[PDB]
Design a protein around this ligand. Sequence first.
Ligand SMILES: NC(=O)C[C@@H]1CCCN(c2ncnc3ccccc23)C1
Ligand SMILES: [Zn+2]
Length: 140
Amino acid sequence: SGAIYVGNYRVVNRHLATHNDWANLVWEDSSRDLLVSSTTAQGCDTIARCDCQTGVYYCSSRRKHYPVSFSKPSLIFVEASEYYPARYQSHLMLAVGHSEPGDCGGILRCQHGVVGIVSTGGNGLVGFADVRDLLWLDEE
Ligand SMILES: NC(=O)C[C@@H]1CCCN(c2ncnc3ccccc23)C1
Ligand SMILES: [Zn+2]
């Protein structure tokens, strides 16, 4: 589990969104595994606006933050899950790293701020849903 709290937005994996998230929905995109809901309190996270390919992510199944090199956001194949049919997830970045399903929501960050959240993984791969192109998270 995990979320990004930026301004009056809460960014979570769409597959982990709560009823309160759907009842206060701002935007959602199944192809990206992302959902954004509105919050009453202002958040402290800042979004990175960059093309970094190195950063650090949080892995809840190890209680550890790991430095990783990651690919550029792309259209990748993801295995069938009870959350998604096997399919093409967009804006996804891959790195070598431990992941379990519960780890989704962990933040990946670089020197500029939050880059994305754990979204996929398996066999020593971890995938991250990028949020750096969502410029509207910084306003309104
Ligand atoms: N965006 C998606 O397709 C959601 C899937 C749902 C099922 C779990 N998926 C995984 N995520 C992270 N780490 C993992 C480690 C081992 C196995 C699976 C995963 C993410
Ligand atoms: Zn950066």
